Structure formats: structure tokens, C-alpha cells
């Protein structure tokens, strides 16, 4: 019994970040990397399944990315993931959600898990695409935005609740194995803050022609800092800031 959890090490930008000279991305000097928030919940959900079960449940985390990602994978192991896999070659640089979907699927075909979990979206690019792309390449049952999962290892169906717009859920009975994209709030990750197996493209039968920017389903023309709305910033002491809020409250 095996749950494979696809995880992403996301980038967040520091203040005063700048676009690269080529205009295709932000300068990496301004990026701080950490595990995608959604992945904390997906991993916790797999761990909850492992702990609920008498049957052995192997929890394997898999990420497609460069060597920085090892740090995130190690923390997943420290939190109780059984194994961790990083897939990379430089040729994979610029791979969009669909291409990463394809790469992940090549690993999943070999791991042959009973369930695959992915986050609903990434905090950085927020494609909300990768997990469901995996489901397509696997040709597996799937559901996106899962806020509750009723599943016992070995079951050929699960009941999920998807979190919908406007404060409602929908119960869905789904065939297993399945790919599920996991939503914030499904659980309360306990650690709220074994080597890593390194896999090349060759190791999974892929080449530069299968991956990277040229194989993606859109091309970046440019990235830029848009002019956005600007607030009226109330400077001063805490007293005068509060005083101004109350004046606005009284105006209202």
C-alpha cells in the first residue's frame, strides 16, 4: 500500500525584487524557497492514512526540480515520509504544469502507488493544473479541491468532499486508485512551521525533447511588475493611525 505525494518547493520574492535583464523571470537572488503550503496538508493527509491503518502504508514524496528541492524533501522525510524522490535534469528548466505532469507520471508509473495526492495549486505560480495533468497522463479517476477524504487503504472507492464556491461542499464517490488535489484545511498539519533518491530524465526514459520550455503549452513573452492599485498609506504613530481609522469609521 503506497501513497505518492507530489510536492513542489515554491519561491516567494523578497522586497525590492527585480526582473532579470532578459525579462523572462525574476532575478533568483530575490527568491526564498520553501515547501508549497498545500503540500503540508497533502503530506499530512497521507500520514493520517498511514497512522489510521494496521496495513503498511508507504508514503513517498516526489518533486521535479533542481538540487535546492532536496532541502524540502528532507523535511518531508523528517515529518515521516518513508521515501523521497527528486527528478531533474537542466533540460527540464521552464517546464510548465503539463510537462511537469508528464515527468511526474513517468515516476508514478514505476512507483505504482494506490493513491496520488497533489496540492490544489502552488503558492508561487498558482496554475492549479499539475495534479490534474498527472491524472490525464495516468488515465486515472480524479477530483480537484478535496477538503475531506474517507478512504481505507485497499478500498476500490473513496468518498471525498470538494470545497466549492460560496460555502458549500460536494460529496463525491470516486474510484481508486485516484489522483486527488488536496485543499487547505483538510487537516491540521502537526509540524506547522533515508537519503533522497535522485532520478535523471534518462532514468525515466525521457530526453531534453520531452521537457522544458519548448514542450510547454504556452510560451512566456515577458514577466513584468505591473502598475497596481495604491492605497492611501496613513503614516504616523499608532495613536494617529488609530485616530484616522476612527474618523473613517465615523465618516461611514
Amino acid at each position: 500500500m503506497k501513497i505518492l505525494v507530489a510536492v513542489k518547493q515554491t519561491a516567494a520574492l523578497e522586497e525590492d525584487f527585480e526582473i532579470r535583464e532578459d525579462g523572462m523571470d525574476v532575478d533568483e537572488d530575490f527568491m526564498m524557497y520553501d515547501l508549497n503550503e498545500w503540500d503540508d496538508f497533502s503530506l499530512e493527509e497521507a500520514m493520517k492514512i498511514k497512522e489510521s491503518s494496521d496495513t503498511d502504508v508507504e508514503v513517498v514524496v516526489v518533486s521535479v526540480g533542481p538540487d535546492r528541492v532536496d532541502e524540502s524533501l528532507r523535511k518531508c522525510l523528517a515529518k515521516g515520509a518513508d521515501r523521497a524522490v527528486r527528478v531533474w535534469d537542466d533540460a527540464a528548466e521552464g517546464s510548465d504544469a503539463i510537462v511537469v505532469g508528464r515527468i511526474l507520471t513517468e515516476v508514478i508509473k514505476k512507483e505504482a502507488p494506490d493513491m496520488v495526492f497533489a496540492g490544489v495549486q502552488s503558492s508561487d505560480q498558482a496554475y492549479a493544473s499539475t495534479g490534474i495533468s498527472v491524472a490525464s497522463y495516468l488515465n486515472w479517476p480524479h477530483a480537484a479541491v478535496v477538503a475531506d477524504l474517507q478512504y481505507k487503504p485497499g478500498d476500490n472507492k473513496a468518498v471525498i468532499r470538494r470545497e466549492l464556491e460560496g460555502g458549500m461542499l460536494q460529496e463525491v464517490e470516486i474510484n481508486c486508485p485516484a489522483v486527488l488535489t488536496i485543499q487547505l484545511g483538510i487537516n491540521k498539519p502537526r509540524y506547522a512551521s533515508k537519503p533522497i533518491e535522485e532520478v535523471s530524465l534518462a532514468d525515466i526514459g525521457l530526453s531534453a525533447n520531452d521537457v522544458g520550455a519548448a514542450q510547454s503549452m504556452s510560451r512566456v513573452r515577458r514577466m513584468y511588475i505591473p502598475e497596481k492599485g495604491r492605497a492611501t498609506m496613513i503614516e504616523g504613530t499608532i495613536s494617529e493611525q488609530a485616530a484616522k481609522i476612527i474618523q473613517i469609521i465615523n465618516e461611514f
Binding site: 474510484n175 473613517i248 469609521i249
Partner: protein, 319 residues
């Protein structure tokens, strides 16, 4: 050329985003001669033709599938067949929870052009150029789709304006491809939690976010809200944690505070999903120690200050 628009309905109601997409599609097309094709999918979807017989709909296709409401296998098969039948240059889906279920699967099989959560779209010559966010909304990423004769876009809700008035589309009925879905929809659910106040009716909100830190800190903001005469609401994480009821949650998956005239956002970054519930509010005050917080891009007033210090001083001054 044809632009295909996939409408969205749930629980017998058409989701308004459907009309936003039609607005988008009509704005997008290159000549008058171009046609907007709208499809509505569901086992009882004929119900929606009046609501979809609106300005800017040239053709309305009612697709009868096995499920009443969204099912990802049904929708994927159906939309694939629509694309096959209509050869659209562009397919517009809402960036909605339903679309999340299948949009990127559709795009994986066929290598159509694909981009999600798009909030600018135009033709430059014959080149489709879509813009979406990057790095937690801190940049715009502008993309095109070289050599893709069909591009599938999901469209950010509440960005594109609907057209006004009725239309006279040619209405057709098709059966969805015969696919046995690998899931079955069961009950819709509204989960427990207190519901003493309907936050869509209230005019003055103080809303708290993850910046409050610990559940022990909720009480002081409840007190401030009480003293000010505001209704206490929150962002999703606060409700997720059980610290306030889900009925107080503002945003896409919570409530839209349609009645709110003054919204004080405290320790809330301003995610797109939170903004969906409150960006319409005519006076938004944001209190947040991160000047790079998205919330400041829609707030009228910004205070870059510690929320606890502000809360204490507000309390003192009000009393």
C-alpha cells in the same frame, strides 16, 4: 473563427461567471464574422437556455451527459467533442473549482495551448496573448501559444464584464460522448458551525487573518468589533482552524460580503480568493505589517502597523 465558451451551473442555477466569459469572448474576437459558441453541460441543462440566450451568444449547445452537475470525466469528454465539432481558435472556461477538475487534463491529451487564471487577453494581430500572475500575484506573466490552432484558457472570475440584454442564438442539442464516469456525485453539503449572522447582509466588517497568530488573540478582535459595531469576519485559514465559524469566512469559498460598505482587513495578505469576497467594498482599510501584501493594491487606506497595537489603541480611543 469560433470562440467556445463553457458555461457553469450548479444546483439549478447558472453561475454568473458564465456571462463574464461571454463578455470576454465577444471582446476577444477579431471580426464581426467571428462567432461565440456557448455550451452548457448537464443531464437537465435545457433549463438554462433562456438564461444563456443573451447578447453575444451566436450558438448555444446543450450537451446532455450522465450527470446533473459537474463531473470531470463527463466534462472532459464533452468539451473535447465540442472542440472537435466547432474547431474553435479559443476555448474559455471559468477558473472555477469545477474547471479545476478537468481543464488541465483536457490540455494534456491534445497539446492545445493552455493557460489558467488569465485576467488579460487580447489578439495582437493573429497572436493570442494572455496575461496571468506570477510569484503570488507580484508580477504579470504574459504568454502566447506559438503554433497552437486551439488555445484553452481558464478565466479569472470577476474580471471581465458581462454584456447587457438578450440574444437569439441558434440552439442545438447534442448527447455527450458515452463515457462511464469514474466518480459519482452525492450530496451537496453545508457543514456545521454557528450561523448567527448572515455576513452577506452586513454593512461594516472587521476581518481577521492569519496575522492574528494564535487562537487566544481572536477574543480581542471580537471585542474591538463589538465596541466598533462591526461584524467580525475572517479569512479562510482562521475558519479552517475552527477559530471562527465558516459562516464568518469571506472569499471565493466563503461568502461575498455584498452589503459591506466598510471592510477593515487586519492581518490579511489579500489572496485573490479572499479578494473575490470583498474587493467590491467601497471603503477598505488594510492593517498589515507587509507593505508588499496584495491587500494594499485594493485598499483605499493602508496602515503598515502591528495589528495588536492598532487594535488596543482603537479600543482605547473608542471607549
Amino acid at each position: 473563427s469560433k470562440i467556445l465558451v463553457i458555461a457553469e451551473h450548479r444546483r439549478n442555477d447558472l453561475r454568473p461567471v458564465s456571462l463574464e466569459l461571454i463578455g470576454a469572448a465577444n471582446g476577444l474576437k477579431k471580426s464581426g464574422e467571428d462567432k461565440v459558441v456557448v455550451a452548457v453541460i448537464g443531464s437537465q441543462a435545457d433549463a438554462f437556455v433562456p438564461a444563456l440566450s443573451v447578447n453575444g451568444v451566436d450558438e448555444l449547445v446543450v450537451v446532455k451527459g450522465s450527470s446533473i452537475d459537474f463531473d470531470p470525466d463527463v466534462f472532459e469528454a464533452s468539451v473535447s467533442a465540442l472542440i472537435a465539432a466547432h474547431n474553435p481558435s479559443v476555448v474559455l472556461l471559468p477558473h472555477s473549482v469545477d474547471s479545476l477538475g478537468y481543464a488541465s487534463s483536457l490540455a494534456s491529451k491534445t497539446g492545445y495551448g493552455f493557460a489558467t487564471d488569465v485576467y488579460i487577453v487580447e489578439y495582437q494581430g493573429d497572436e493570442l496573448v494572455a496575461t496571468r500572475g506570477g510569484y503570488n500575484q507580484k508580477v504579470n506573466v504574459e504568454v502566447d501559444f506559438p503554433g497552437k490552432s486551439t488555445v484553452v484558457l481558464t478565466i479569472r472570475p470577476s474580471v471581465f464584464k458581462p454584456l447587457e440584454g438578450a440574444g437569439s442564438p441558434v440552439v442545438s442539442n447534442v448527447d455527450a460522448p458515452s463515457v462511464q464516469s469514474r466518480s459519482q456525485n452525492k450530496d451537496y453539503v453545508e457543514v456545521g458551525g454557528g450561523n448567527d449572522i448572515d455576513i452577506t447582509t452586513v454593512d461594516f466588517i472587521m476581518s481577521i487573518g492569519r496575522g492574528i497568530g494564535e487562537e487566544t488573540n481572536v477574543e480581542q478582535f471580537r471585542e474591538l468589533a463589538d465596541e466598533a459595531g462591526a461584524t467580525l469576519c475572517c479569512s479562510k485559514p482562521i475558519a479552517d482552524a475552527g477559530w471562527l465559524p465558516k459562516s464568518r469566512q469571506v472569499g471565493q469559498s466563503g461568502k461575498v460580503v455584498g452589503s459591506c460598505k466598510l471592510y477593515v482587513a487586519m492581518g490579511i495578505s489579500g489572496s485573490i480568493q479572499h479578494m473575490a469576497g470583498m474587493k467590491h467594498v467601497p471603503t477598505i482599510i488594510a492593517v498589515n505589517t507587509d507593505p508588499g501584501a496584495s491587500i494594499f493594491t485594493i485598499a483605499k487606506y493602508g496602515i503598515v502597523a502591528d495589528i495588536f497595537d492598532i487594535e488596543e489603541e482603537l479600543k482605547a480611543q473608542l471607549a
